[PDB]
């Protein structure tokens, strides 16, 4: 975005810089180990309240 002004004139050179830098990492683990003991011809249970 450059402009020109024919009515004024700046003194010298100015640069006015600005820097920005960012880095990031993440790591989520979530583990489950479930046992159940059961029988061969096991049926469901109907309680359900």
């Amino acid at each position: 975005a450059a402009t020109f002004n024919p009515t004024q004139s700046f003194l010298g050179f100015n640069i006015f810089p600005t820097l920005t830098a960012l880095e990031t990492q993440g790591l989520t683990r979530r583990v489950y180990d479930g046992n159940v003991t059961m029988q061969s011809g096991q049926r469901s249970l109907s309680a359900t309240g």
Binding site: N5, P6, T7, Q8, S9
Partner: protein, 142 residues
């Protein structure tokens, strides 16, 4: 870019009165500055006046000047606003030039005094783009 500034001299009340062989005493027995106004024309840049050079000095008609070596002055920091008009203009400033409201008008008047014979001044300075400027004000009396 153009520079166009005009000046109103107003050289009255500039000579000291002494030709009174009479007196303000009982009965003729016992008791025997110029304001320069600079204004910028419409469409002109801003300019700052730094000094003046006296190119011609004539007391009663004698050129006591030596134009090879004028009498320079460097005692002026006088700002002449641009010669535009807008909304955000302060008292002694100039418009940016891109207000979308800006007109070309006469600049704000700025004054200077030189207490002083007819001399021919020449003010100098630089514009808002830093280029040299000269303005002759020939003819001022006493």
């Amino acid at each position: 870019g153009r520079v166009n500034v005009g000046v109103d001299v107003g050289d009255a009340g500039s000579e000291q009165v002494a030709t009174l062989t009479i007196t303000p005493e009982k009965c003729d027995d016992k008791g025997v500055p110029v304001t320069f106004t600079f204004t910028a024309r419409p469409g002109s840049e801003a300019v700052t006046i730094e000094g003046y050079r006296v190119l011609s000095d004539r007391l009663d008609g004698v050129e006591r000047a030596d134009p090879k070596n004028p009498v320079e002055n460097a005692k002026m920091n006088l700002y002449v606003p641009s010669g535009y008009a807008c909304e955000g203009l302060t008292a002694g400033a100039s418009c940016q030039g891109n207000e979308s409201d800006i007109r070309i008008a006469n600049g704000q008047p700025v004054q200077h005094q030189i207490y002083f014979r007819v001399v021919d001044l020449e003010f100098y300075g630089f514009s808002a783009n830093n280029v040299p400027f000269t303005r002759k004000v020939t003819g001022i009396v006493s």
